[model samples]
Target: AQNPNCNIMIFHPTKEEFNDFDKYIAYMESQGAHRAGLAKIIPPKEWKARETYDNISEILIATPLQQVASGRAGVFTQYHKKKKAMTVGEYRHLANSKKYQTPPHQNFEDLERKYWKNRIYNSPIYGADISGSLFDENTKQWNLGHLGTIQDLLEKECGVVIEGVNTPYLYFGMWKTTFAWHTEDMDLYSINYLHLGEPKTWYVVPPEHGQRLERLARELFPGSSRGCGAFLRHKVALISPTVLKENGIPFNRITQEAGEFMVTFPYGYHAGFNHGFNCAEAINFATPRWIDYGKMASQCSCGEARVTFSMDAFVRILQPERYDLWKRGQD
Candidate 1:
């Protein structure tokens, strides 16, 4: 009752409880547990994020740093506009390469150093950190998190399903690797678990204020192209918390440490950067509440409806095995 706006919150379940896949799944689906939140754990021998997170330096097989530094790799600059987009490699090369270094970036070396200090958000190199879909049916990744549990229920009960709900993405970053301010697709909830490395910082605005943020950003950076101050692109102006507060919009800030989980609520305006070198896995999910918002977020385009539930049956899985049994009587 105290958290009216659904401001950022943290959770710490007993390691024993959190360890079992079914137990963890039940807790997240139980009442009052749908909200976005975080948790941490030692990478068990079988978990995938563990293998990828622990071996951070060598885990990244695709988005190689050397390529990024050489102007070879190109990726999503910020949003989907898709120009002759400069991949991180291309962008870094502007300053890293002696042959490509030009004036304004002459202090290319210094600028490069400074740019990386706050790497990603300003110009996030998407798909840099690669990982298998967290919700992959063939693997045990989903068992480590609650997402797959709910997904299965909806599919069996209602035959509804949504894509990308189970496939979590990896964000490999150096200091300043950034993800711009935006909401999860279809206004669904998102969870980011910091596998390891320096803590990442976050700034968030609740759903009600998401529009306010867009308006504020528009007001601040008016009369412009680049998605008309959408604030989704790299190098775009940021609507700082101070700026939002001054304009009557409240916000929250959190510093996420290694092994910690960071959850973003539906339509929450969230943006942040890794404090230093880091690796994190992020995935999307939907609760009952998400049905409407998902529809709303896609109403303009789809004009119909679709839901993605996990491909499984509940009754066979001891649907009676109550989640949070100890707390069942009180609630």
Candidate 2:
């Protein structure tokens, strides 16, 4: 042991990579894994990110740097605000629609392209890609009837439990907030997939967002309008329950290694993130519908909490409007 007077100058700069497998695993806890979803896989997955003799700062900060560096992030920077409040035409308009998206708006198109591309990349039509986009604010109301069939489809196709899910077509988009550190209050269980380029999780939660909302709600909307962001609609961050210190290390997620789809459970204080190309997903809505199993477990994930569920858990058994949404405005 050397004292303060003792000179300890065997100085050689050493860099650490996040791939420190041990460090990855140590980061995940029910509430401690803030900045979750940054890793490829939890401690178990073989290929992981680690700190190297190179830039050690990435281990602590999350950025789209890797994405931009890979040239996957198209040249576009945009943040979308709810244009014209709510419209049925806009509600039903597919991201591929000409009106909502045009070649002239290609830059912004590439920017928002993440909206449709996220659903199905490079593919022209996703969700219900259309040519004519006419928003009707009046008819913009859906209970729990729309998603049962798709949930069934996901179950039969993916072998996961996707039931009573209110499939989201409303706010599924790719936009940014006004400020860098701003947050939103969205409430929906989702199956997030990254297509085209790389996986860049824009926002997520570190713990139960409800209580966090109790404090942040003041920040987003102070007045009587009180409920504005995800809170107004009822949503929160989906944080994973793990840590980077303990999670094992692995190589970056290659497209060949990614699945066609990945599902996320309800939100806790914290959740996790992943990456993929041409990925698919499933989710449940707030409204109730026909259940594959029962309401006992699914509902407990009520309001807007990211909990665990099988892909089949949100599958659609019925195809009521089989080709309707997809066939609204055809070529």
Candidate 3:
């Protein structure tokens, strides 16, 4: 029962088209592609990442059972509340074990129950800051961090280094590994590139439906919503697309394969799971339009003491001369 509105746009861009990063992105946004919240970009086959996991030895392991049982939702809670330190070699062996990989349920209900009852290990090596590795210096133009469009418009404006937002974070995923629903921090746009891996399935809701999605989540998880208007920021809730569609939410599904890129839009809520073992890199960027969303994000209570970086500070630092000229012209 796939809704027609759920179709995600997949763009196959030539090296030249992708190289002209900003122009292509502006064109896509003009075409209303961002309305879907996410789009898939299949880059020219020649571009490749240089890093490999051969030298990597350790990783953080997440316990799915703890996450499923923990009444609190969000990755921050899961990371601090239910996590283990393990070597990559031992983690790989356990991930490939029959019990974890074998299909135990045919339906979402059964799968949900099994996840709650069993000791399932879906280890995601997330937020590993590997700023210097992965990218080829010669081809840094297309590097997620160096993309001309995002760099000139967003990253350079920040005038400060934000590890996972401006710099890159590598992610290692395994079967059934999940990133629960949430918008990117500060509602900024994000781009994820799969250097090499099995396909990752993503479910995204358009920004237009952002409020409705939050309402639905609040109704479904009342406890999490109580006194926490931005509970989704916790990144702990995982809802199925089938249920979303049944409740009149429009969600687009995308399968991101190796060598492909997925771009997320501002305020577009997204969640996804990995199909199998894979390695990926992601970073967040914002365009001028994101200023409004950033302002909105600043007002939300995220239920934690963590303070978001000041958007006012960023705007003040970003192109002060141009801002003054604009202000003078307005006056």
Candidate 4:
């Protein structure tokens, strides 16, 4: 974190101006950031990660899907190829040895219990997914971007650069009932979402189900993700029929029909693209299990995850709560 203290301290002005600037920044931030807005979780404005927030695989994992970028990918799972799937050990370890710290006031046992349930209990008919923003109870729309970190990592770790124009983009999805959907346990997730005038019913399968589908695909279309470049079932379909991300089935396009809500645990094997004939623009953000982002510009994170690099850590260090009362509201 370059000059980490700058976020907390100021020494640029005369004593009077320094104090004034401090007070104003606090008040302005208060007026701008509301306690009510804390939960609003609006999409971030376009801002690159500061030279800080690097080497932080935690933050790296939660890359802020930039506005537009493109990625090409292939799929691979042991089951489909009749090869053994990657064992949980292949997942190796979490970013921090602390293994995802528990939030304050929440006991480790409670958090662990939840995570344990998350791992063992699969999403019925699909994978376990509970989305907050950019989505109502099910899927969301909008072409988001993947900042440089994820892009670089994909290049390094998964050989994920395909033939396409690159720009900012975002990648988010899940399975709900009719709306049902979504793994971790070295998952190799990859894909290329090409936006050409309209979206389609794209089957988005999780690592497990994807495995089965890949097997079938190999049987039908040889030289797929099972053969060489690992090209699993990447098909083009119509947008109206709906792509079932939970079952890998493209709803009948020529006919007008809404498919049934059958699958759910990470079984989002399909997605129906919405192509109202807007543009020939497409964006994709994808990555796989093992790869490396050799070297580029990358820094450690100073956000909410780690105890040492988070604003909460600084909050405790400075005891800002003592002055939080300065904030009150009317209009």
Judged by lDDT, which candidate is best?
Answer: 3
Consecutive 10-residue window with the lowest summed lDDT within model 3: 68-77
Give candidate 2 misplaced runs (Cα > 4 Å): 1-189, 224-263, 269-282, 285-331
Q: Write the per-residue lDDT of candidate 4 for residues 4-98, one digit (tens) a residue.
A: 21111111223233233225333423443211111011122332112231222221112211111111112211110122222112211311123
User: Which regions of candidate 1 fall more than 4 Å away from where they truly are?
Assistant: 19-56, 61-129, 133-146, 149-165, 223-237, 298-331
Window of ten residues with lowest summed lDDT in model 4: 254-263
**Candidate number of the best TM-score:** 3
lDDT of all predictions? 0.48, 0.25, 0.63, 0.23
Per-residue lDDT for 1-331 in model 2, tens only? 2222211111111123223322322332222322232222212223212222132111211111111111122211222222323222332243335533333334433433444233222222112111121122231211112233444544554466544433332112212211111121122233332322223333233222334533443433354124232232222211111221123211111111221222222231222122221222233432121132222222211232232233223311232232233123111
Q: By lDDT, is 1 or 3 better? A: 3
What's every prediction's RMSD, in angstroms?
11.8, 18.9, 7.5, 24.6
TM-score of 3: 0.74
- True-vs-predicted CA distance for residue 44, candidate 1, Å: 12
Candidates' TM-scores? 0.58, 0.28, 0.74, 0.24
C-alpha RMSD between model 3 and the true structure: 7.5
The digit string of per-residue lDDT tens for model 3 on 145-231 reads 575443345556555543222466666666666777889766878989887656677889988788988988888788778856677
Which rank order by TM-score, best down to worst?
A: 3, 1, 2, 4
